[PDB]
Structures are given as structure tokens and as C-alpha cells.
Amino acid sequence: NVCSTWGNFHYKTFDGDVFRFPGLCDYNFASDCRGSYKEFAVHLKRGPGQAEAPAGVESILLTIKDDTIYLTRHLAVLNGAVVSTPHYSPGLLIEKSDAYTKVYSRAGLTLMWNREDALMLELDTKFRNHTCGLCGDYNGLQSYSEFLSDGVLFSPLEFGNMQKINQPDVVCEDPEEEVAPASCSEHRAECERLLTAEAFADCQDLVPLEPYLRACQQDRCRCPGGDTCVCSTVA
Amino acid sequence: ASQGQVQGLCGNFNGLEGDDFKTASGLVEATGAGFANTWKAQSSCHDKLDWLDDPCSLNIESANYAEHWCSLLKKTETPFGRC
Amino acid sequence: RALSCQTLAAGYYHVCPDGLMDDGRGGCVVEKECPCVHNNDLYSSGAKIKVDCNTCTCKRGRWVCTQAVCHGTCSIYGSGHYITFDGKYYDFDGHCSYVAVQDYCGLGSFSIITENVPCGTTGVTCSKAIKIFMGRTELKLEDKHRVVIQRDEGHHVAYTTREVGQYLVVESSTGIIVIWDKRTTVFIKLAPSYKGTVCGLCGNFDHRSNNDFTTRDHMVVSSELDFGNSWKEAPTCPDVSTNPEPCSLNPHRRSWAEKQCSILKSSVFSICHSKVDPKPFYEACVHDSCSCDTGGDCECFCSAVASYAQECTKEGACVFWRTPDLCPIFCDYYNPPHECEWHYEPCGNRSFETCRTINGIHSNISVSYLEGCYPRCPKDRPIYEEDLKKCVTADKCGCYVEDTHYPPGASVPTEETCKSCVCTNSSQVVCRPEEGFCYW
Amino acid sequence: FGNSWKEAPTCPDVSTNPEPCSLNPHRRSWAEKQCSILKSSVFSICHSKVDPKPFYEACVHDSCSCDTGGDCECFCSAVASYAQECTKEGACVFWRTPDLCPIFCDYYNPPHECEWHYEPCGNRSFETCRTINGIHSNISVSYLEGCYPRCPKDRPIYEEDLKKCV
Amino acid sequence: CTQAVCHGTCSIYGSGHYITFDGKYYDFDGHCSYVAVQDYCGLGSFSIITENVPCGTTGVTCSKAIKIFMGRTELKLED
Ligand SMILES: *[C@@H]1O[C@H](CO)[C@@H](O[C@@H]2O[C@H](CO)[C@@H](O)[C@H](O)[C@H]2NC(C)=O)[C@H](O)[C@H]1NC(C)=O
Ligand SMILES: *[C@@H]1O[C@H](CO)[C@@H](O)[C@H](O)[C@H]1NC(C)=O
Ligand SMILES: [Ca+2]
Ligand SMILES: [Ca+2]
Ligand SMILES: [Ca+2]
Known part of the structure; x- marks a missing residue:
């Protein structure tokens, strides 16, 4: 199915389970936890905080079993070399339209990202019961093990915190538990x-x-003033 | 004065480094984990196996950091260059 | 108190009841019937195994082995990788003629030299010829052929040259053996009568590996580049100062090398992982693949993988790793037009009949683990003559006099006086006198 | 003429044709030595039926360029291209040796029954289970190199999608 | 000789060596997807595309995959 992320730090796993994890440091968006051999891994990197309404992405690292693709706002790098898009290798396709950047792989991986906020990933059915990234597992169960693993119902923030990646040059602080705001049902x-x-x-x-x-609901009340934060959901 | 009268993970200390993996029950082993398992002090522990991988290939974000500093050992101008 | 047949010698310092002890195979067993372990394999009581010259037995959970001295082996391979007689790996990249082994150690009976030349552009060097001095005769292995030089008049120390699998084997009746793969690999085997009386790049073979870095003038050093530099032959040859790093000087070739050489660590060689450590062979494979940057780099890789497959065979794991896309081997080229007798034997475990062994001649080493193509001679002429690579009848093979093959019937050349010789029609070389003065 | 047939407009435009043997001088000596087999006596029968110069140049040009791995595969294909034309014009030449571009055919054989053979110039027509039912092509491909079956006399139909004599 | 029209042949080989249907040799080293053949020539029924990528460090390029469009079916020769 499709894992997606958009809007004001809105996420959506392979089994729905829409939540909000305003992390900002670095995270494991998706991976193949088969245990024997790691086929692929998609690592997401948020920004330093653009503004109250938007939530961008700095760059994306994507490794497929032999090679790494590093996608930035302006350029794409393959194995440390800048490539003039599109590229047509016999196991990997990269294309750069004006509204999207798309990557197709023969392993059954499709990635589509607009350079500002919206990102979505599609996998085949081969990787069920193996995904272990921030997108949860791909068993098809609705919030079965993602949030209730050993009986404890994980809150979204702590579940997201566990999926961090330690860069051994910079220390980044995890976001603190915010005070539970009122259920913004006045704008339903x-x-x-x-x-x-x-x-x-x-x-x-x-x-x-x-x-x-x-x-x-949250988007409308958490984002007062300009409607730059509500029309990013209907998109 | 204790040449050949020691046994353990540190070998026999006799001048030859080919019989170091010589188990306490005769023949010599081939790998590093096979020999070690025979010197467990608790029968309940399990057996391990060698690991045929390089950690610098699984943690890519750390490879540049590890290289940039560990490479100082070969820089002749650096203080370690004296050694 | 819980013994386990593996903590027997430990001591139990820090399930089965009292008495019986766990065996690791299942239910509890008495101490007497406690099994043995070796290379991750579990053998019950009263078993048998061989280690390279001897035979062992699992007696009481402990091994009891015969005590005979195996031969000694030195290995030269790759772009300057050396393994001495006592098991001390190292590297050295020289450009001169170096003493591989000899007996003139401070009066001697032989000497084995080597010729290293540059191969690549990164500065590494590899062996490309061999010279063997025996008494006064001088054999030279060169250009895929053996050339005799300065053959002594009447001593002619008995040797024997033949071709087994892909390798060329030269043995001497005195106890020296040289195995050459015709490209860069060399194995020198010595009988246990030379123990502690040799010197050279292959150490001094005394079952002690803290003194194999003995220089020419009987000094023990701690540096590879000083030990190596002292055994050059021509004093005008330069001296090595640093070991080149191929994969660092050719960055663009790394990606390929690290991908092809990864087969050693794959599942294909899963059987051999518990018997031979693959890391020192993976390193050599990568080191060699980054350096062959002037042509023919698909040949540096296949030999590197074969060096490890051969050891896996030698330890008892016959592995079939060649495929039509990976280092293919073309055996049936030797067959007659379309009769199929030559077969690729992955691990050489075959003992057939040649016209040498048919007459009682036997070697002194087991070379039954060498890769290559082997005959399967038919049942109407089942004797394999070697000097022509031909399956022939037991009668018409040859004579094999003075290390030279002579067809049956052919008048045998003779370096004697008044003595004519002929190979009979019974594979028998017989000589007669001629009174043309001289007599019988 | 080339730059006008690209599919994606964003693709760059070629400005010059590089010279491999000039950018890699140290690889020339090897390339000019192996590729010389085309002009040697081995292909003496074919010299009057195909002009080898454009193939010699292709061999040398390719061998100077495969400088990132597996350069023994750029050379065998280059020589096979010329050998195929020599076969096509009526000159069947046997040029492979255990030291020069070996081929490993008996890999396909059952344990030790010998039925696959390297056919130097493919001039052999046998019975598959397609042609047994009247299916035929529209061209002759009887000049393609490779390993071919010689199915026995107790099951003599070669099934292709499994490579089996049945 | 009898007069029948043989099939036509175009050849692509090596590091960008081309032989056209009418017997004209040349070289070309591109890095994109190029039209090998098609009959949408100024409404056509097929098209055959090729995919060239660099192979080496001197800048030359070689074909590595093929795409065949026939009516609506699409075959791809690859790996
Ligand atoms: C295997 O080793 C034996 C042991 O020496 C060799 O036998 C020697 O043969 C030479 C000449 O044939 C004799 O002068 C020696 O006296 C023999 N040795 C003994 C102890 O009798 C034998 O030749 C070796 N194998 C081969 C093929 O040479
Ligand atoms: C595991 O089985 C399949 C994939 O193997 C998947 O569709 C299913 O949802 C998974 N179920 C569980 C309980 O993990
Ligand atoms: Ca689930
Ligand atoms: Ca020791
Ligand atoms: Ca020694």
C-alpha cells in the first residue's frame, strides 16, 4: 500500500493510523527488517523549523541494496556524483518533473516527493511483515503492533522518538510532550x-x-490566519 | 619462566602462533569463535558464531566521521607520526 | 554442578542430575560416552578423522592422534602475498630476483629463486618465473613451460615433471616438491628431513614462528621491508620503502572489486565458513582486483577465488562455484571430435591408472585436491599416458627414460657409448651393445 | 543528426567524440596486442570475404575504454562480432581456446551424460516441439554461436522454455 | 541472379557504433533514450527505443536496455 507524510507534521502508515509527530532531527521513514539482508531503507530529514504553518524536508537518503540516492531541494546525487535527470540505469529510474521528483526501482519501490512538504512511498506486497520504519509494519493490521506491542498503548510522540537515527557529530533534542490542547471540533x-x-x-x-x-481539525486551529495549512490536506 | 604452562583465551605462550587455537581436547580449530566457546565458565551460556560483515557498511552516516579521524594515524605531521 | 562435555576442562567456577552430563546432542549421557567436537561438527565416540598426515579418534570426549611429522609448505601468491613454513602471513612488493628458499644457510644441496616484476601501474609486483638449482642441474619454469639448463653430465639427480589438473608439478627424489599454476601461484613442499636447516623468504621451518624474519646475516628484525630487502640477489636492485595501497590509488575501480570479491562471503561458500577463515582471502581478492589496471583483470580474480576454493577442498568441502557467467572453464576442448571423456572435476577426488603407476612408480604426496579437467578413459584402452594426454592400451604407452617420453618402438636416444636402445612393443625399453672398439 | 532524436528534452547534447586510447595511454599496448588476432593467420580464410579493418578499429576502441572492471568481456564480444560475419559469408572458423575467451557448455548436461556441445558456427537444424507442430520463423538464424543440444534417440524433441530433451 | 528483396538490417554494437539499414557506419556517444526505429514519421504502428548509459570514465556510452512498443503492448529487454 502507500505510506504518506504531509501538512503540519501529519503522517500516515501503511495501515492508516494518522497521527502527528512534530520531530525535527532525523528519522527512519521506512526500512526492510527482514533480518537476513536489508533490501532498502528510506531515511527522512526534517528541517530546522520553517515556520508555524509549514513543515518542510531538507533532504532524503535512499539506499537500494547497493547504491545510495541523496535527493535535495535543487539537485540529486547518485553514488556521490551529480546526475542530470532523468537517468535510465537498468535497475533504477530517477525523473524530475516540475511538480514532483519520482524514483522507480525494480525491487518494488516507488517514491514520489514534491520538493516542499508532501512525500509518499509505495511498496509491493512482498515486504509484508518486514517493514520496521516510522511507517510501522506492513502486516495490514490497523494499529495492531505499531502502538500496542506489549499491551502498552504507545503515544505517538514516544513511538516516533524511538525511530531516531544517531548522527555521531551533532546532538539533537527530541520534542517535549506538549500540553493536551482542546479537541478542535469547533471547525468540523x-x-x-x-x-x-x-x-x-x-x-x-x-x-x-x-x-x-x-x-x-487540528490543522484549522493550530494554524491561525493564512490558509496555508488547511489546503495542504485536501491536496 | 612460564612458557607453555598457561591455557585460556590468551593462548599457550610457546612461540608458535598457529597452535593458539588448540582446544583443550586435542585438535586445533579454524575460526575464532569455535575455539573460544570451549572455554565457557558457565554451562548454561549459548554458542556464538563469527560475523562476516563490516560495520562501516551498515552505518553509512558514521563512515565519514570514522574515517576523518581514524585516518590521523597515518599522517606523518601529526603527533602519532613520530611512532 | 552441571557439566556439559564442553566445560570439562573449564572447571565449573561460577537439567541433568548428578553423574550424567549434558552432551549437547540431546539427553544426558555418562562421562564415558561423552562425544567430541571439531570445527562445529559433533562426532560420537569411537570415530575416525585424518589431519593432513595422521589419523585421530574420539576416545572419551578427547582426541587421540598418531604422531607423524607432516611435510612443510610455503605459499607465494597474488601481488606479493607470502605464507612461510610456520604460518606467518605477510606482504612484500619487490622488483628483483629473491631467494625463495635455499640450504646455503651459513655445504648446502639446493636453492629455489623467484623473479618478481611489476604488474600494474600502482607499484605492486608479482612473480612470473621460477628457477630450481639441484646439485648442478637448473630447471626454469617460464612462459608456461619447463626448460632444463646445464644438465649435469652423469649425476642427474632423479626428478619428475608432470601435469595434474591445471597445475604443473615438479618433484625431486631427494624430497623437494614445487607446484606451479603457470600464472603466479607457487607452493613449495619439503620433507621433514630438512627441518631447521633452510633460510629465505619462506622462513626456516622449525615449528616456531617468532624467528621467521631472520635476515641474510643471521639477525632477527621486526620489519617486513627490511627482512625482504636483505634477500635480493643483484646488489644494484633498488630497495622497497613503502607498500602501495591499490584501491586507494584507483578509486574508480573499487566499486567493481568489492562486488565481485563478495562471493567469498556469500551463501555459496556457506559450507566452508566454519573450516577456513575467509577474511584473509577476501582482502587478497580486493587487493588484487584494484591493481590489475592494464588489461586482463578477469584473470586476477578467478585465481584469487580458486586459491580459497582449493583450501576448502583440502579441508573436506567440495564446492562447485563456476558458472557460464563467472570464470568459465573450457574442458571438452581436449576431447576427440565428439566422444566425451574429459570432465571438469570440481575437487579432483579421483584416482585412475596411468602408465607410470602401472609399473610401480609412486609419488610421495597426495595431490588429489587440485582443480581442473580430468580424463575418464574408455574401457577399450584404459591407461592414461601423461606426456601426450592420451588414453591408450596398457601396452602402447611409453618408456619414460631420463624424464623424456619415447613412443613405443621408437629408437630410444641414449647419451651413452656403443649402447643402442629401443622401446619394445611391450612398453619395455631395452638396450643392446654394438661392436663397431667396444663390446657388450 | 544524433542529438535530434533524443527523447527527453532535458538530456544534454553531445559536443565531441572522445578518443579512449588517447585518454588511457597505458592500456594501449595490451589492446593493440590482443585485438591483432583479427589480422593474424587464424582468420586467414575470412580475409577475402570480410574487410577486418572496421572491426579491428572497433576492438581497439573498445578495449581502451573498459577501464572500470571486466575488460575481458568487451574483447570477446568484439571478436565474436567479426567471427559471426565470417560464418555468415561461408567461413566457419574455430577460434576459442582454453586460454582465449573460453566457453563452458557442459554445465547444462545432466550429471555425466554428454548431450550439450559447443557448436562453433551453429549450422545444425534439429527438432523442437514448436517446429514439430508446423510453427516456423521467417528468417534464418542458423549462424548464431553457442552451445546446442544433441538429444538422444529415445526422447528426441528439444523443449526450449526448460532446455530439456523430452 | 534471381530478384527478391532481402530483409533489412540495422546494427548497434560496442561503445556506440551504429550501422544503418543502407550500409553507413558511424559513431555516436549519447546519454539519453534515443529512437532506434519508428514509423511515426510525419499514423505508424510501432517503435523501438534504446537506452544508452556511460560505461567507462572516458565519456563513451553503450546500450544497456531495449524497449519495444507494438500497438499497445510494451516489451522490455533488460537484466
Ligand atoms: C619418495 O621418497 C623416497 C624416499 O627416499 C624416494 O626413494 C629414493 O629413491 C632414490 C632414487 O630412486 C634412492 O637413491 C633413495 O635411496 C630412495 N630412498 C630410500 C629411503 O630408499 C623416492 O624416489 C621418492 N619418490 C619419487 C617419485 O622420487
Ligand atoms: C503476515 O503474513 C502476511 C505476509 O507474510 C501479511 O499479509 C499478514 O498481514 C501478516 N500477519 C501477521 C500476523 O503478521
Ligand atoms: Ca499493523
Ligand atoms: Ca602459541
Ligand atoms: Ca621458524
Whole structure:
């Protein structure tokens, strides 16, 4: 299926489970914890904090079984060399459109990233019961082991904290537990009206609605003023 | 004055470094873990096996750091250059 | 108090009841029937195994072995990798003629020299010829052939040259053996009568490896580059100062080398991982692949992998690792037009009949572990004559006089006087006198 | 003419043709020595039926360039290209030796029954289970090098998608 | 001789050596996806594309994969 991340630090695993982890240092977005041989690993790197509304990404590291791709805002590097996109190696395709950057692999990996905030990854069915990154496992269970492993219901922040990567030159502090804000249910009508418009007719049966509107709930109240933070969800 | 009268993970101390893996029950082993397992002080412990990998290939973010500093040992101008 | 047949000698310093002890195979057993272990293999009581010249037995969880002295072996291979008689690996990259072994150690009976020349552009050097001085005769292994020189008039110390698998084997009746793969590898084997009476790059073979760095003038040093530099032959040859690092001087060739040489650590050689440590061979493979940068670099790699496969065979693990895309071997080239007799033997464990051994001649070493193509002669002429590589009848093989093959019937050349010789029609060389004065 | 047929507009434009043997002088001596087999007496039959110069130049040009690994695979293909034309015009030449571009055919054989053989110039037509049912091609590919079966007389149909005599 | 029209042949080989259908040799070292053949020539039925990538450090390039479009089917010769 698809793991996704967008908006004001909104995440979505392979089994739904939309939450919010405002980490900023570095994290293991996805990986192959088969144990014998690691086929691939996607590492995400947030920014230093762009502003209150947006939440960008600095660069992405993506290793597939022999080679590393380092994608930045302006350039893409393969094995330490700058490549003029597109590239057509016999086991890997990189292309750079204006609205997206796309990477296709023969192992069953597809990555699509717009250079600002939105990122999504698609894997085949081969990697079920093996993924171990921030996107949770890929067993198809809805929040089964991602948050309730040994009976303890993990809060999103602590679950995200465990997925950190230690860079042996810089110490980065994890975010502290914020005071539980009020359930922003006062803006539910606005989110429902905006999302369930006419232009979104033939997908009311393809994608659910509850998670994406719940995401709009916090987005609307956490992001006062400009509507740069609500229209990044309906996107 | 104790040449050949010691046994353990530190060898026999007789001048030859080929019989160092000589177990306490005759023949010589081939790997480093096979010989070591025979000197456990607690019967309940399990047996280990060698590890055919290099850590500098699994932790890429650390490879540059490790190199940039450990390479100082070969720099003649550095204080270690004297040795 | 819980013994386990592996902590027997430990002491139990820090399940089964009192008496019986765990064996690691299953239920508890008495001390008498306690098994033995070796290279991650579990052998019950009363078993048998061989170690390179001897035979052992699991008696009481302890091994009891015969005590005979195996031969001594020195190895030269790769771009300057040396293994001495007492097991001390090292590296050395010289450009001169160096004393591999000899007996003129401070009056001597032989000497074995080597010729190292540069191969690459990073400064590394490799062996490309061998010279063997025996008494007064001088053999030279060169250009994939053996050349005799200064053959002594009437002493002619008995030797024997033949070809086994992909290797060329030269033995001497005195107790010297040289095995050469025709490209860069060399094995020197010595009988246990030379113990502690040799010197050279291969140490002095005394079962003690803290004094194999003895220089020409009987001084013990601690540096490879000083030990090596003192055994050069021509005084005008330069002196080595530093060991080059190939993969650092050719960064663009690293990616390939580290990918092809990784097969040693793959699952293909999973059987051999518990019997031979692969790291010192993986390092040599990578070191060699980064250096062959002037052509023919698919040949530096196959030999490096074969060096490890041969040891795996020698220790008892016959592994089949060649594929049509990885170091292929072309054996049936030797077959007759379309009769199929030559076969690629992955680990050489075959003992057939030649026309040498048919007449009682026997070697002194087991070379039954060398890779290559081997015959499977048919049942209408089942004797393998070696000097022509031909399956022939037991009658028409040859004579093999003075290390020279002569076809049956052919008038045998003779360096004597008044003595004519002929190979009979019975594989028998017989000589007659001629009274043309001289008599019988 | 070349730069106008690229598919992606963002792809760069070629400005010059590099000279491998000039940028890698130390590899020239080897390349000019191995590739000389084309002009040697081994291919004496084919010299009057195919001009070797454009293939000699290709061999030398390729051998000077494969300078990152596996340069014994750039050379054998270059020589095989010329050998294939020599076969195509009516000159079947046997040039492989255990030291020069060896080929490993008996790998496919069952344990020790000998049925696969290296066919130097492919001039052999046998019965597959496609042609046994009237299926035929529209060109002759009877000049392609490789290893071919010689299926026995008790199951003489060669199935292709498994490489088996049945 | 009899007069029948043989098939036509185009050859790609080596580090960017090309032989056209009419017998013209040349060299070309590109790094992109190039049209080997097609009949959408100024409405056509097929197309054959090639994929050249660098192989070496001197700048030369060689073909490493093929794509065949026929009607709507797409074969890819690779690995
Ligand atoms: C194997 O070793 C034996 C032991 O020496 C060799 O036998 C010697 O042969 C020479 C000449 O043939 C005699 O002068 C010696 O007296 C023999 N030695 C003994 C102890 O009798 C034998 O030649 C060696 N094998 C080969 C093939 O040479
Ligand atoms: C494991 O089985 C398959 C993949 O092997 C997967 O679809 C399933 O959801 C997994 N179930 C559990 C309990 O891990
Ligand atoms: Ca789950
Ligand atoms: Ca010791
Ligand atoms: Ca010694």
C-alpha cells in the first residue's frame, strides 16, 4: 500500500493510523527488517523549523541494496556524483518533473516527493511483515503492533522518538510532550464542507474520510490566519 | 619462566602462533569463535558464531566521521607520526 | 554442578542430575560416552578423522592422534602475498630476483629463486618465473613451460615433471616438491628431513614462528621491508620503502572489486565458513582486483577465488562455484571430435591408472585436491599416458627414460657409448651393445 | 543528426567524440596486442570475404575504454562480432581456446551424460516441439554461436522454455 | 541472379557504433533514450527505443536496455 507524510507534521502508515509527530532531527521513514539482508531503507530529514504553518524536508537518503540516492531541494546525487535527470540505469529510474521528483526501482519501490512538504512511498506486497520504519509494519493490521506491542498503548510522540537515527557529530533534542490542547471540533463543519465538495465526487468510495478530516481539525486551529495549512490536506 | 604452562583465551605462550587455537581436547580449530566457546565458565551460556560483515557498511552516516579521524594515524605531521 | 562435555576442562567456577552430563546432542549421557567436537561438527565416540598426515579418534570426549611429522609448505601468491613454513602471513612488493628458499644457510644441496616484476601501474609486483638449482642441474619454469639448463653430465639427480589438473608439478627424489599454476601461484613442499636447516623468504621451518624474519646475516628484525630487502640477489636492485595501497590509488575501480570479491562471503561458500577463515582471502581478492589496471583483470580474480576454493577442498568441502557467467572453464576442448571423456572435476577426488603407476612408480604426496579437467578413459584402452594426454592400451604407452617420453618402438636416444636402445612393443625399453672398439 | 532524436528534452547534447586510447595511454599496448588476432593467420580464410579493418578499429576502441572492471568481456564480444560475419559469408572458423575467451557448455548436461556441445558456427537444424507442430520463423538464424543440444534417440524433441530433451 | 528483396538490417554494437539499414557506419556517444526505429514519421504502428548509459570514465556510452512498443503492448529487454 502507500505510506504518506504531509501538512503540519501529519503522517500516515501503511495501515492508516494518522497521527502527528512534530520531530525535527532525523528519522527512519521506512526500512526492510527482514533480518537476513536489508533490501532498502528510506531515511527522512526534517528541517530546522520553517515556520508555524509549514513543515518542510531538507533532504532524503535512499539506499537500494547497493547504491545510495541523496535527493535535495535543487539537485540529486547518485553514488556521490551529480546526475542530470532523468537517468535510465537498468535497475533504477530517477525523473524530475516540475511538480514532483519520482524514483522507480525494480525491487518494488516507488517514491514520489514534491520538493516542499508532501512525500509518499509505495511498496509491493512482498515486504509484508518486514517493514520496521516510522511507517510501522506492513502486516495490514490497523494499529495492531505499531502502538500496542506489549499491551502498552504507545503515544505517538514516544513511538516516533524511538525511530531516531544517531548522527555521531551533532546532538539533537527530541520534542517535549506538549500540553493536551482542546479537541478542535469547533471547525468540523468547515472541514467537512470544504473536503466533500463537487470536485471530489468519484472518490467517496475509494478513500475514507474520517482520518483526513480529523487531520483538518487540528490543522484549522493550530494554524491561525493564512490558509496555508488547511489546503495542504485536501491536496 | 612460564612458557607453555598457561591455557585460556590468551593462548599457550610457546612461540608458535598457529597452535593458539588448540582446544583443550586435542585438535586445533579454524575460526575464532569455535575455539573460544570451549572455554565457557558457565554451562548454561549459548554458542556464538563469527560475523562476516563490516560495520562501516551498515552505518553509512558514521563512515565519514570514522574515517576523518581514524585516518590521523597515518599522517606523518601529526603527533602519532613520530611512532 | 552441571557439566556439559564442553566445560570439562573449564572447571565449573561460577537439567541433568548428578553423574550424567549434558552432551549437547540431546539427553544426558555418562562421562564415558561423552562425544567430541571439531570445527562445529559433533562426532560420537569411537570415530575416525585424518589431519593432513595422521589419523585421530574420539576416545572419551578427547582426541587421540598418531604422531607423524607432516611435510612443510610455503605459499607465494597474488601481488606479493607470502605464507612461510610456520604460518606467518605477510606482504612484500619487490622488483628483483629473491631467494625463495635455499640450504646455503651459513655445504648446502639446493636453492629455489623467484623473479618478481611489476604488474600494474600502482607499484605492486608479482612473480612470473621460477628457477630450481639441484646439485648442478637448473630447471626454469617460464612462459608456461619447463626448460632444463646445464644438465649435469652423469649425476642427474632423479626428478619428475608432470601435469595434474591445471597445475604443473615438479618433484625431486631427494624430497623437494614445487607446484606451479603457470600464472603466479607457487607452493613449495619439503620433507621433514630438512627441518631447521633452510633460510629465505619462506622462513626456516622449525615449528616456531617468532624467528621467521631472520635476515641474510643471521639477525632477527621486526620489519617486513627490511627482512625482504636483505634477500635480493643483484646488489644494484633498488630497495622497497613503502607498500602501495591499490584501491586507494584507483578509486574508480573499487566499486567493481568489492562486488565481485563478495562471493567469498556469500551463501555459496556457506559450507566452508566454519573450516577456513575467509577474511584473509577476501582482502587478497580486493587487493588484487584494484591493481590489475592494464588489461586482463578477469584473470586476477578467478585465481584469487580458486586459491580459497582449493583450501576448502583440502579441508573436506567440495564446492562447485563456476558458472557460464563467472570464470568459465573450457574442458571438452581436449576431447576427440565428439566422444566425451574429459570432465571438469570440481575437487579432483579421483584416482585412475596411468602408465607410470602401472609399473610401480609412486609419488610421495597426495595431490588429489587440485582443480581442473580430468580424463575418464574408455574401457577399450584404459591407461592414461601423461606426456601426450592420451588414453591408450596398457601396452602402447611409453618408456619414460631420463624424464623424456619415447613412443613405443621408437629408437630410444641414449647419451651413452656403443649402447643402442629401443622401446619394445611391450612398453619395455631395452638396450643392446654394438661392436663397431667396444663390446657388450 | 544524433542529438535530434533524443527523447527527453532535458538530456544534454553531445559536443565531441572522445578518443579512449588517447585518454588511457597505458592500456594501449595490451589492446593493440590482443585485438591483432583479427589480422593474424587464424582468420586467414575470412580475409577475402570480410574487410577486418572496421572491426579491428572497433576492438581497439573498445578495449581502451573498459577501464572500470571486466575488460575481458568487451574483447570477446568484439571478436565474436567479426567471427559471426565470417560464418555468415561461408567461413566457419574455430577460434576459442582454453586460454582465449573460453566457453563452458557442459554445465547444462545432466550429471555425466554428454548431450550439450559447443557448436562453433551453429549450422545444425534439429527438432523442437514448436517446429514439430508446423510453427516456423521467417528468417534464418542458423549462424548464431553457442552451445546446442544433441538429444538422444529415445526422447528426441528439444523443449526450449526448460532446455530439456523430452 | 534471381530478384527478391532481402530483409533489412540495422546494427548497434560496442561503445556506440551504429550501422544503418543502407550500409553507413558511424559513431555516436549519447546519454539519453534515443529512437532506434519508428514509423511515426510525419499514423505508424510501432517503435523501438534504446537506452544508452556511460560505461567507462572516458565519456563513451553503450546500450544497456531495449524497449519495444507494438500497438499497445510494451516489451522490455533488460537484466
Ligand atoms: C619418495 O621418497 C623416497 C624416499 O627416499 C624416494 O626413494 C629414493 O629413491 C632414490 C632414487 O630412486 C634412492 O637413491 C633413495 O635411496 C630412495 N630412498 C630410500 C629411503 O630408499 C623416492 O624416489 C621418492 N619418490 C619419487 C617419485 O622420487
Ligand atoms: C503476515 O503474513 C502476511 C505476509 O507474510 C501479511 O499479509 C499478514 O498481514 C501478516 N500477519 C501477521 C500476523 O503478521
Ligand atoms: Ca499493523
Ligand atoms: Ca602459541
Ligand atoms: Ca621458524
